[PDB]
Design a protein around this ligand. Structure first.
Ligand code: HEM
Ligand code: HEM
Lengths: 89, 89
């Protein structure tokens, strides 16, 4: 299913630098919150969209394929998704 | 067994700050290599000694029992142990 522990640690080790607190320090309005994603994430607010962006990157956001493994990409995507849907940031 | 992927991400998120590359930026000779640990780690170079220090801390090194859960502690201890034994640092 979803290893949110692996998710959280992967998030801290690789994403926190630009997305601490569910925010976006590079492009301020493209945060990791539900609303923002529903509006800016290509593919919609769903696990598929998040995973695809993590794998391939987007603009100033780097690609994580070949850096993270599918388990790590999957867990971090679930973590981001769960934090967002639950308003947990 | 302890998941080494979780171990790697836990190490990066929480330990890399002072132990990047298996080194020690605070007390230079107290590195994460087998020899160093054989000499300085209470209990000698073994998985259990590593786990105990991570849980409890030592001097300037903080304790992690609050910050990390048992699976993350077990995983990071295994990762550090495997890196040192294979001289992978
Ligand atoms: C870590 C592996 C990581 C994750 C997870 C992550 C997620 C992510 C999402 C879901 C978005 C979409 C948000 C939205 O409202 O559309 C997104 C967007 C951007 N990110 Fe990211 N991101 C991760 C890592 C990083 C890192 C390391 C940086 C900084 C160098 C970063 C930056 C950005 C930027 C910029 C965007 C917007 C991309 C665009 O639409 O142009 N992310 N990220
Ligand atoms: C992350 C959770 C983490 C781990 C793993 C870790 C391991 C570790 C070991 C096994 C030793 C012993 C090395 C030896 O040769 O004896 C050790 C020692 C020290 N560490 Fe550490 N460490 C982790 C995290 C941190 C962090 C974030 C810092 C810096 C703030 C830090 C620093 C130190 C220091 C200093 C020591 C020496 C302790 C002493 O004997 O006086 N560690 N670490």
């Amino acid at each position: 299913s979803a290893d949110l522990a692996l998710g959280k640690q992967t998030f801290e080790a690789n994403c926190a630098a630009c997305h601490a607190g569910g925010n976006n320090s590079v492009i301020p309005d493209h945060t990791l919150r539900k609303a923002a994603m529903e509006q800016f994430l290509q593919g919609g607010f769903n696990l598929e969209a998040i995973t695809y962006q993590v794998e391939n990157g987007k603009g100033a956001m780097p690609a994580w394929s070949g850096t993270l493994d599918d388990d790590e990409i999957a867990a971090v995507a679930a973590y981001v998704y769960d934090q967002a849907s639950g308003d947990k940031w």
